[PDB]
Amino acid sequence: GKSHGYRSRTRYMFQRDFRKHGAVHLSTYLKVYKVGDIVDIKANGSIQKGMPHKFYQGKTGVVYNVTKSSVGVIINKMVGNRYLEKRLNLRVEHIKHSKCRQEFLERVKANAAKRAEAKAQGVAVQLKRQPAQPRESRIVSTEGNVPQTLAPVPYETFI
Amino acid sequence: VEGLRRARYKFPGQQKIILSKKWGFTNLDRPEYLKKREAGEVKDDGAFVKFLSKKGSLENNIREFPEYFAA
Amino acid sequence: QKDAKSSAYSSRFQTPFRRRREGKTDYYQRKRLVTQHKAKYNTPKYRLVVRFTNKDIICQIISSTITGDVVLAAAYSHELPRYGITHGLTNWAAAYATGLLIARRTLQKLGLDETYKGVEEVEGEYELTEAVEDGPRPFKVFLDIGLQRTTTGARVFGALKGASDGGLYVPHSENRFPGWDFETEEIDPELLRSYIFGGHVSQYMEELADDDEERFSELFKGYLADDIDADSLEDIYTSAHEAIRADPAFKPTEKKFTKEQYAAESKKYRQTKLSKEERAARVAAKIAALAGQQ
Amino acid sequence: SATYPMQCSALRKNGFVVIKSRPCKIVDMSTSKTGKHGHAKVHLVAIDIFTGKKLEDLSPSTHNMEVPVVKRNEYQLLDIDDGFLSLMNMDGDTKDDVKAPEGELGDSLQTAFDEGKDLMVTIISAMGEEAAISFKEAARTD
Amino acid sequence: QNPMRDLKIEKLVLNISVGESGDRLTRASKVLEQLSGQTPVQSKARYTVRTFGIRRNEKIAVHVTVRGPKAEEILERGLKVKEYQLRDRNFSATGNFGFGIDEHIDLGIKYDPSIGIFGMDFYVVMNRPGARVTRRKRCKGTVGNSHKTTKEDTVSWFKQKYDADVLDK
RNA sequence: GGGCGUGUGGCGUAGUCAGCGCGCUCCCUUGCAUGGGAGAGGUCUCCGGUUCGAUUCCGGACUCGUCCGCCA
RNA sequence: GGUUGCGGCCAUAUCUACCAGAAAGCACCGUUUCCCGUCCGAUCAACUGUAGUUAAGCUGGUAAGAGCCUGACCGAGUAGUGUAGUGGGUGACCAUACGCGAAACUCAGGUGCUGCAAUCU
RNA sequence: GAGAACAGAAAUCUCCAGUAGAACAAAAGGGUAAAAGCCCCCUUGAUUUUGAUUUUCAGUGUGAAUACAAACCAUGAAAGU
RNA sequence: AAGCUCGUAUCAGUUUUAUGAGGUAAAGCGAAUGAUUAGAGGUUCCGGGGUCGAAAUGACCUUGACCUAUUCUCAAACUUUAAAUAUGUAAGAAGUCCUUGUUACUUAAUUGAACGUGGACAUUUGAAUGAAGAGCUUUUAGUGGGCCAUUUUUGGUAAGCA
């Protein structure tokens, strides 16, 4: 018959990695999570308690509950034609903070600093990001850079 | 070439007979292998040949391959 | 030819942690010590780290951060001459005095010393520093004995007893103290008090000085050089205890020099690395030497 | 439980079955198709272990038949008196509840105990009734 | 050079394999106990072998470990039993050496008719000072190459002390 | 073609991850009848795996004996 | 800058073979009355810091060293791949257009950094 | 790998090398080295009370599991589990 | 189908930026597991066949193993490495910063946790593009035999086959 267990098809997903097996380092236990933090989920195969299901591997969610050794995380799961709210109790070995959130907060504080310093002059702050604009005019010189003519190479076996 | 051309009839599909630019069953070219074997940095094996490298311990590189260091 | 390791072995080998390779840290014990209840968010957990080397006892109060461990206060056994203890700097009572010193020092620098005076009149009874009402809780600290063996009579528990009588709230039971009867599950207080005041070394001093005098000159030579007899060590432990309860303030040494003054001599004495060009010159000379037909 | 179900096709020769609430041991099995379209029927010929009677039953192959639990146990004789054997278990337990065999097995066992061999007795349990089937002699540990 | 490179006997281990449990085992254990002055330890069988007749875990051998000058004294008695002649094959690559002897009568216990006759295996383990580095729990390390005991050093020590000669084979 | 069972000393076979009995060959004892004790005799069909260990647990292969292979 | 205690990252830190180590600190080291544990005070426990030693541990250096780490316009815009055609070819498969882009190999360099407290010519 | 009477291919003892090439009840795959393996000591948390959550999923049931709360316990020096 | 609450948004089968997760394609085997071709150098208290040897833990060849350095070819249920395409989250007003209130939680401790009071920051309010209105509810029909094409792919010699 068919087989769809709780950890089916999780072979390479829950292998550890090359040459970093063994016990886990103490930074994962010394990291501090608060309610509202945004965290990434990546399971550790060395810890069998508090494991996430294989669906939530690589998923990103929001902390809603902090307990003794675990963290409650909220994920949005697509079920059919809508998203449902899923609450997960995961031990802290299987989560880490999302770095995109802290990058955005750094942008927020630097952006507020720019607005605060330029408010003393009113110099059209222009605080929105802009994407890659087309590159403008330039003059390239041939002083020591005379062009070299290239041609297609004929065919050879090369074995 | 005639032996390979006779052997090609026993195979399905299309095969080509190409005269390689390499020396024997090695992977260097003919003048590259010639300018390598004029120095002592090649040394024969049962059918193949072992080559000298600039890496490794100098004691092993001198017990093997003596004629190149005999400069 | 026999003790040879392949390149495949050395490529697939995974090294342990550096402290495990040095054999100094039990990470299985460290994880259970330094981790915190996550609902106590940034609350530090404090370890009384007690380590026994030859000729020293090291007591520290240590919390853990990601960038490394942080020490509130440390107390070594080699600063006991300031309090009047000159000989036996690693005996069970020296461990007691070091624990008492680090307890009084931490409560002084935290300001929790006018309350929680600890056990002023010591008798060898088993009790913990209980919380006084309508005030702050006592300072809570946990042992880190490291790789040292737990054993009834070991002096890590003497350091524990000294720190507990100094006013720290350290959780412990009494079944590892000297004087614990195994069959009758109770603690004998007078033998523990004798050990606090050095009875086990003074009784040996008497029972070896009465018969074997060459041993009494080989060991306990410093006791004869400083005329310390068997009965006076009890009162010098008492005077050391009251000197600790007077001032644990930890004046450091004067260092006799500067950091760069030590660094000049040690930088002169240390060996340096060989650069790439002189390494190439060395191997060219070696090729011209042995492979140059002698 | 004392007894457990099984399928007729799952049964095979030298196995135990329950026929008419008797522990029986099969000697013959034969399957014949009922009709060309239909399923085959199993005809079972078996012998009761205790009484030796021959009992037969035919059933559908997919039908489930009852199967007993039969345990064979090894003991040493102590005495044969009044038709009741007295046996001795490993770890020194003793039972006298077993009745002596009544046939040529019982006669041979009685003569062997009279002339003084050390006799090893096999007694079987199935569905709450107890009997002795065979005896040997201990070649070593005399 | 040589401040504390001096070889010494780490231990002497005396092994008797009676091969089967019971009265012999107890008699061999009594012989080992009276010879050592210490109670001996019996060792269980790892696997069942029919040809030997052994099964798993019947304490088929008995052995004792003696350290110090007493071990040196029993080694003196064993060497005077062996007439201070040992094969070159007896020594090992690590530097440890052993020999096997028949009966304790040559050792001089004297004979009781009950206790029987049992031969012995003597094994001497040799080390230099500083061997605690491997044995201690904290900061366990490996011993350096120069300080290691070897076969040539142990045969030189066995020629110099005990004024004995080794056989060429 | 498919499925099931089958191989143990000459025979009957039994079995815990090779035993007896009757054969065989000797010896001993005592009829009316005997009986006892020794031996020679078994790659458990074969080959692997598993297991401390496999007759025993499994897989593959051989032999032999069975039972089906139907409606059009 | 050396050393110790507790660490963080967990080989640039490991492994092999040699060499060196002032001071201090670690270490080996001396002992079995007491607590305690062993067949064995070897490990563990306790005592002394006394009788000694850098021989080992430890630290550092060396090696056209093994390994590991970093980089390259080195291989290679190669292999692979998203999209397109009433493209080629009997087919197998393959070119082109708009895009993305490896691994092995080769070469060059490197061989622990650092936090808290104490202590040191 | 090198040794030690009987003792040899396999009995017990000693040393060295040994990233797991072993073991963890069973199928297979993950995980584990001062351990999750082997040995020893003490125990019954394989307990009570109802909730929440994950998988299968209709976000029903059943099975299995996760993290807590309120008790009462076990173990250890203790953190804890 | 009936609408209801609102009026340009608590949107989007899309892109960019930042940040995750994956073990396929490819590649690799002088890297682990497994398969596999060929010689070379060694090991015999440590193999087997011959010949010379009284025999010899004898010799000489040969052939097998094991080791060492090479060499040829591979893997759906092998792997150090590792794409492309797909895929999670974020790009603020429900935000940021400052100050200090509550608690029976928590801390050695106004230490922290959560929710707050008061104050400051507004149209470039925090990337692009588009918005066709956005959000919400009730009720009920039919359907629950499918098939084909490109690409990936399984069984099969194959099939207008499954």
PDB file of all heavy atoms in Angstrom, chain I residues 98-107:
ATOM      1  P     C I  98      13.977  55.160  22.508  1.00  0.00           P
ATOM      2  OP1   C I  98      15.336  54.874  23.030  1.00  0.00           O
ATOM      3  OP2   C I  98      12.929  54.114  22.573  1.00  0.00           O
ATOM      4  O5'   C I  98      13.427  56.455  23.254  1.00  0.00           O
ATOM      5  C5'   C I  98      14.192  57.649  23.295  1.00  0.00           C
ATOM      6  C4'   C I  98      13.424  58.782  23.925  1.00  0.00           C
ATOM      7  O4'   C I  98      12.272  59.142  23.116  1.00  0.00           O
ATOM      8  C3'   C I  98      12.827  58.501  25.289  1.00  0.00           C
ATOM      9  O3'   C I  98      13.779  58.548  26.333  1.00  0.00           O
ATOM     10  C2'   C I  98      11.751  59.570  25.394  1.00  0.00           C
ATOM     11  O2'   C I  98      12.325  60.826  25.720  1.00  0.00           O
ATOM     12  C1'   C I  98      11.242  59.635  23.951  1.00  0.00           C
ATOM     13  N1    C I  98      10.007  58.834  23.743  1.00  0.00           N
ATOM     14  C2    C I  98       8.762  59.293  24.213  1.00  0.00           C
ATOM     15  O2    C I  98       8.694  60.372  24.820  1.00  0.00           O
ATOM     16  N3    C I  98       7.656  58.539  24.004  1.00  0.00           N
ATOM     17  C4    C I  98       7.742  57.381  23.353  1.00  0.00           C
ATOM     18  N4    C I  98       6.631  56.668  23.169  1.00  0.00           N
ATOM     19  C5    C I  98       8.984  56.891  22.872  1.00  0.00           C
ATOM     20  C6    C I  98      10.069  57.646  23.072  1.00  0.00           C
ATOM     21  P     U I  99      13.660  57.534  27.569  1.00  0.00           P
ATOM     22  OP1   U I  99      14.915  57.619  28.356  1.00  0.00           O
ATOM     23  OP2   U I  99      13.206  56.219  27.049  1.00  0.00           O
ATOM     24  O5'   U I  99      12.483  58.144  28.452  1.00  0.00           O
ATOM     25  C5'   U I  99      12.585  59.455  28.987  1.00  0.00           C
ATOM     26  C4'   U I  99      11.254  59.944  29.499  1.00  0.00           C
ATOM     27  O4'   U I  99      10.292  59.998  28.418  1.00  0.00           O
ATOM     28  C3'   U I  99      10.587  59.067  30.542  1.00  0.00           C
ATOM     29  O3'   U I  99      11.103  59.284  31.842  1.00  0.00           O
ATOM     30  C2'   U I  99       9.121  59.445  30.409  1.00  0.00           C
ATOM     31  O2'   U I  99       8.852  60.649  31.110  1.00  0.00           O
ATOM     32  C1'   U I  99       8.999  59.724  28.912  1.00  0.00           C
ATOM     33  N1    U I  99       8.409  58.606  28.137  1.00  0.00           N
ATOM     34  C2    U I  99       7.046  58.357  28.205  1.00  0.00           C
ATOM     35  O2    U I  99       6.268  58.980  28.904  1.00  0.00           O
ATOM     36  N3    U I  99       6.603  57.322  27.422  1.00  0.00           N
ATOM     37  C4    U I  99       7.353  56.532  26.584  1.00  0.00           C
ATOM     38  O4    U I  99       6.805  55.637  25.938  1.00  0.00           O
ATOM     39  C5    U I  99       8.744  56.851  26.560  1.00  0.00           C
ATOM     40  C6    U I  99       9.204  57.856  27.307  1.00  0.00           C
ATOM     41  P     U I 100      11.242  58.061  32.871  1.00  0.00           P
ATOM     42  OP1   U I 100      12.056  58.522  34.024  1.00  0.00           O
ATOM     43  OP2   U I 100      11.665  56.862  32.105  1.00  0.00           O
ATOM     44  O5'   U I 100       9.756  57.816  33.381  1.00  0.00           O
ATOM     45  C5'   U I 100       9.024  58.844  34.041  1.00  0.00           C
ATOM     46  C4'   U I 100       7.535  58.591  34.004  1.00  0.00           C
ATOM     47  O4'   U I 100       7.154  58.147  32.673  1.00  0.00           O
ATOM     48  C3'   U I 100       7.030  57.520  34.967  1.00  0.00           C
ATOM     49  O3'   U I 100       5.723  57.875  35.411  1.00  0.00           O
ATOM     50  C2'   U I 100       6.947  56.285  34.081  1.00  0.00           C
ATOM     51  O2'   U I 100       6.053  55.290  34.528  1.00  0.00           O
ATOM     52  C1'   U I 100       6.508  56.893  32.754  1.00  0.00           C
ATOM     53  N1    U I 100       6.893  56.089  31.587  1.00  0.00           N
ATOM     54  C2    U I 100       5.892  55.382  30.965  1.00  0.00           C
ATOM     55  O2    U I 100       4.738  55.423  31.347  1.00  0.00           O
ATOM     56  N3    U I 100       6.292  54.635  29.891  1.00  0.00           N
ATOM     57  C4    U I 100       7.568  54.524  29.387  1.00  0.00           C
ATOM     58  O4    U I 100       7.772  53.808  28.409  1.00  0.00           O
ATOM     59  C5    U I 100       8.551  55.285  30.090  1.00  0.00           C
ATOM     60  C6    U I 100       8.189  56.019  31.144  1.00  0.00           C
ATOM     61  P     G I 101       5.201  57.389  36.846  1.00  0.00           P
ATOM     62  OP1   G I 101       4.918  58.591  37.668  1.00  0.00           O
ATOM     63  OP2   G I 101       6.140  56.354  37.348  1.00  0.00           O
ATOM     64  O5'   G I 101       3.820  56.671  36.524  1.00  0.00           O
ATOM     65  C5'   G I 101       3.409  55.525  37.249  1.00  0.00           C
ATOM     66  C4'   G I 101       2.138  54.950  36.686  1.00  0.00           C
ATOM     67  O4'   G I 101       2.202  54.949  35.243  1.00  0.00           O
ATOM     68  C3'   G I 101       1.848  53.508  37.055  1.00  0.00           C
ATOM     69  O3'   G I 101       1.218  53.407  38.317  1.00  0.00           O
ATOM     70  C2'   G I 101       0.973  53.023  35.906  1.00  0.00           C
ATOM     71  O2'   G I 101      -0.382  53.379  36.127  1.00  0.00           O
ATOM     72  C1'   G I 101       1.501  53.843  34.728  1.00  0.00           C
ATOM     73  N9    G I 101       2.389  53.106  33.810  1.00  0.00           N
ATOM     74  C8    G I 101       3.708  53.403  33.598  1.00  0.00           C
ATOM     75  N7    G I 101       4.275  52.647  32.704  1.00  0.00           N
ATOM     76  C5    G I 101       3.262  51.805  32.290  1.00  0.00           C
ATOM     77  C6    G I 101       3.292  50.776  31.327  1.00  0.00           C
ATOM     78  O6    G I 101       4.252  50.406  30.649  1.00  0.00           O
ATOM     79  N1    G I 101       2.056  50.163  31.188  1.00  0.00           N
ATOM     80  C2    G I 101       0.931  50.503  31.891  1.00  0.00           C
ATOM     81  N2    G I 101      -0.177  49.798  31.627  1.00  0.00           N
ATOM     82  N3    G I 101       0.892  51.469  32.794  1.00  0.00           N
ATOM     83  C4    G I 101       2.084  52.083  32.942  1.00  0.00           C
ATOM     84  P     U I 102       1.541  52.179  39.293  1.00  0.00           P
ATOM     85  OP1   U I 102       0.962  52.469  40.626  1.00  0.00           O
ATOM     86  OP2   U I 102       2.984  51.867  39.166  1.00  0.00           O
ATOM     87  O5'   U I 102       0.716  50.973  38.670  1.00  0.00           O
ATOM     88  C5'   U I 102      -0.697  51.037  38.555  1.00  0.00           C
ATOM     89  C4'   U I 102      -1.219  49.842  37.803  1.00  0.00           C
ATOM     90  O4'   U I 102      -0.806  49.922  36.421  1.00  0.00           O
ATOM     91  C3'   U I 102      -0.686  48.506  38.283  1.00  0.00           C
ATOM     92  O3'   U I 102      -1.438  48.010  39.372  1.00  0.00           O
ATOM     93  C2'   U I 102      -0.769  47.626  37.044  1.00  0.00           C
ATOM     94  O2'   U I 102      -2.070  47.080  36.911  1.00  0.00           O
ATOM     95  C1'   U I 102      -0.557  48.633  35.913  1.00  0.00           C
ATOM     96  N1    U I 102       0.794  48.619  35.302  1.00  0.00           N
ATOM     97  C2    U I 102       1.076  47.702  34.311  1.00  0.00           C
ATOM     98  O2    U I 102       0.281  46.859  33.953  1.00  0.00           O
ATOM     99  N3    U I 102       2.333  47.794  33.767  1.00  0.00           N
ATOM    100  C4    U I 102       3.312  48.705  34.092  1.00  0.00           C
ATOM    101  O4    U I 102       4.401  48.680  33.523  1.00  0.00           O
ATOM    102  C5    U I 102       2.937  49.628  35.109  1.00  0.00           C
ATOM    103  C6    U I 102       1.725  49.557  35.654  1.00  0.00           C
ATOM    104  P     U I 103      -0.710  47.502  40.704  1.00  0.00           P
ATOM    105  OP1   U I 103      -1.642  47.706  41.838  1.00  0.00           O
ATOM    106  OP2   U I 103       0.650  48.087  40.746  1.00  0.00           O
ATOM    107  O5'   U I 103      -0.582  45.937  40.473  1.00  0.00           O
ATOM    108  C5'   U I 103      -1.678  45.200  39.963  1.00  0.00           C
ATOM    109  C4'   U I 103      -1.215  43.986  39.205  1.00  0.00           C
ATOM    110  O4'   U I 103      -0.681  44.376  37.920  1.00  0.00           O
ATOM    111  C3'   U I 103      -0.089  43.197  39.842  1.00  0.00           C
ATOM    112  O3'   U I 103      -0.545  42.345  40.870  1.00  0.00           O
ATOM    113  C2'   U I 103       0.509  42.454  38.657  1.00  0.00           C
ATOM    114  O2'   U I 103      -0.260  41.299  38.360  1.00  0.00           O
ATOM    115  C1'   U I 103       0.315  43.462  37.520  1.00  0.00           C
ATOM    116  N1    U I 103       1.553  44.198  37.184  1.00  0.00           N
ATOM    117  C2    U I 103       2.349  43.652  36.204  1.00  0.00           C
ATOM    118  O2    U I 103       2.064  42.615  35.637  1.00  0.00           O
ATOM    119  N3    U I 103       3.485  44.356  35.906  1.00  0.00           N
ATOM    120  C4    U I 103       3.889  45.536  36.490  1.00  0.00           C
ATOM    121  O4    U I 103       4.936  46.073  36.140  1.00  0.00           O
ATOM    122  C5    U I 103       3.012  46.038  37.493  1.00  0.00           C
ATOM    123  C6    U I 103       1.904  45.369  37.796  1.00  0.00           C
ATOM    124  P     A I 104       0.234  42.276  42.269  1.00  0.00           P
ATOM    125  OP1   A I 104      -0.755  41.975  43.331  1.00  0.00           O
ATOM    126  OP2   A I 104       1.091  43.480  42.376  1.00  0.00           O
ATOM    127  O5'   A I 104       1.176  41.008  42.117  1.00  0.00           O
ATOM    128  C5'   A I 104       1.287  40.056  43.168  1.00  0.00           C
ATOM    129  C4'   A I 104       0.693  38.714  42.803  1.00  0.00           C
ATOM    130  O4'   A I 104      -0.752  38.748  42.965  1.00  0.00           O
ATOM    131  C3'   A I 104       0.952  38.218  41.381  1.00  0.00           C
ATOM    132  O3'   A I 104       1.133  36.806  41.415  1.00  0.00           O
ATOM    133  C2'   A I 104      -0.362  38.529  40.670  1.00  0.00           C
ATOM    134  O2'   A I 104      -0.623  37.729  39.538  1.00  0.00           O
ATOM    135  C1'   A I 104      -1.370  38.279  41.786  1.00  0.00           C
ATOM    136  N9    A I 104      -2.640  38.984  41.625  1.00  0.00           N
ATOM    137  C8    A I 104      -2.849  40.276  41.224  1.00  0.00           C
ATOM    138  N7    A I 104      -4.108  40.623  41.189  1.00  0.00           N
ATOM    139  C5    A I 104      -4.770  39.480  41.600  1.00  0.00           C
ATOM    140  C6    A I 104      -6.127  39.182  41.778  1.00  0.00           C
ATOM    141  N6    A I 104      -7.104  40.062  41.552  1.00  0.00           N
ATOM    142  N1    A I 104      -6.456  37.942  42.197  1.00  0.00           N
ATOM    143  C2    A I 104      -5.479  37.055  42.424  1.00  0.00           C
ATOM    144  N3    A I 104      -4.167  37.219  42.292  1.00  0.00           N
ATOM    145  C4    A I 104      -3.881  38.462  41.872  1.00  0.00           C
ATOM    146  P     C I 105       2.602  36.179  41.274  1.00  0.00           P
ATOM    147  OP1   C I 105       2.525  34.744  41.636  1.00  0.00           O
ATOM    148  OP2   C I 105       3.564  37.067  41.970  1.00  0.00           O
ATOM    149  O5'   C I 105       2.898  36.273  39.717  1.00  0.00           O
ATOM    150  C5'   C I 105       2.255  35.401  38.803  1.00  0.00           C
ATOM    151  C4'   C I 105       2.958  35.407  37.475  1.00  0.00           C
ATOM    152  O4'   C I 105       2.712  36.661  36.791  1.00  0.00           O
ATOM    153  C3'   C I 105       4.468  35.312  37.538  1.00  0.00           C
ATOM    154  O3'   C I 105       4.927  33.984  37.709  1.00  0.00           O
ATOM    155  C2'   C I 105       4.894  35.924  36.217  1.00  0.00           C
ATOM    156  O2'   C I 105       4.767  34.977  35.169  1.00  0.00           O
ATOM    157  C1'   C I 105       3.832  37.009  36.011  1.00  0.00           C
ATOM    158  N1    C I 105       4.269  38.386  36.382  1.00  0.00           N
ATOM    159  C2    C I 105       5.299  39.083  35.715  1.00  0.00           C
ATOM    160  O2    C I 105       5.922  38.543  34.790  1.00  0.00           O
ATOM    161  N3    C I 105       5.609  40.341  36.106  1.00  0.00           N
ATOM    162  C4    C I 105       4.940  40.928  37.089  1.00  0.00           C
ATOM    163  N4    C I 105       5.281  42.168  37.440  1.00  0.00           N
ATOM    164  C5    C I 105       3.889  40.264  37.771  1.00  0.00           C
ATOM    165  C6    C I 105       3.594  39.021  37.382  1.00  0.00           C
ATOM    166  P     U I 106       6.173  33.673  38.670  1.00  0.00           P
ATOM    167  OP1   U I 106       6.502  32.237  38.533  1.00  0.00           O
ATOM    168  OP2   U I 106       5.885  34.242  40.006  1.00  0.00           O
ATOM    169  O5'   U I 106       7.374  34.496  38.029  1.00  0.00           O
ATOM    170  C5'   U I 106       8.032  34.026  36.866  1.00  0.00           C
ATOM    171  C4'   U I 106       9.021  35.038  36.349  1.00  0.00           C
ATOM    172  O4'   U I 106       8.340  36.284  36.051  1.00  0.00           O
ATOM    173  C3'   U I 106      10.113  35.449  37.315  1.00  0.00           C
ATOM    174  O3'   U I 106      11.167  34.509  37.393  1.00  0.00           O
ATOM    175  C2'   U I 106      10.540  36.801  36.769  1.00  0.00           C
ATOM    176  O2'   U I 106      11.374  36.639  35.634  1.00  0.00           O
ATOM    177  C1'   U I 106       9.205  37.372  36.295  1.00  0.00           C
ATOM    178  N1    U I 106       8.580  38.280  37.284  1.00  0.00           N
ATOM    179  C2    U I 106       9.056  39.572  37.393  1.00  0.00           C
ATOM    180  O2    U I 106       9.976  40.017  36.733  1.00  0.00           O
ATOM    181  N3    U I 106       8.421  40.352  38.317  1.00  0.00           N
ATOM    182  C4    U I 106       7.375  39.990  39.129  1.00  0.00           C
ATOM    183  O4    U I 106       6.907  40.815  39.909  1.00  0.00           O
ATOM    184  C5    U I 106       6.929  38.647  38.957  1.00  0.00           C
ATOM    185  C6    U I 106       7.529  37.863  38.063  1.00  0.00           C
ATOM    186  P     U I 107      11.981  34.333  38.760  1.00  0.00           P
ATOM    187  OP1   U I 107      12.817  33.116  38.647  1.00  0.00           O
ATOM    188  OP2   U I 107      11.027  34.457  39.885  1.00  0.00           O
ATOM    189  O5'   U I 107      12.953  35.590  38.786  1.00  0.00           O
ATOM    190  C5'   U I 107      13.925  35.769  37.770  1.00  0.00           C
ATOM    191  C4'   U I 107      14.573  37.123  37.858  1.00  0.00           C
ATOM    192  O4'   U I 107      13.576  38.164  37.729  1.00  0.00           O
ATOM    193  C3'   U I 107      15.262  37.437  39.172  1.00  0.00           C
ATOM    194  O3'   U I 107      16.549  36.856  39.255  1.00  0.00           O
ATOM    195  C2'   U I 107      15.277  38.960  39.190  1.00  0.00           C
ATOM    196  O2'   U I 107      16.354  39.460  38.414  1.00  0.00           O
ATOM    197  C1'   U I 107      13.966  39.296  38.473  1.00  0.00           C
ATOM    198  N1    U I 107      12.875  39.668  39.406  1.00  0.00           N
ATOM    199  C2    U I 107      12.833  40.970  39.861  1.00  0.00           C
ATOM    200  O2    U I 107      13.645  41.817  39.541  1.00  0.00           O
ATOM    201  N3    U I 107      11.803  41.257  40.712  1.00  0.00           N
ATOM    202  C4    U I 107      10.829  40.395  41.147  1.00  0.00           C
ATOM    203  O4    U I 107       9.963  40.805  41.917  1.00  0.00           O
ATOM    204  C5    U I 107      10.933  39.068  40.630  1.00  0.00           C
ATOM    205  C6    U I 107      11.926  38.759  39.795  1.00  0.00           C
TER     206        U I 107
END
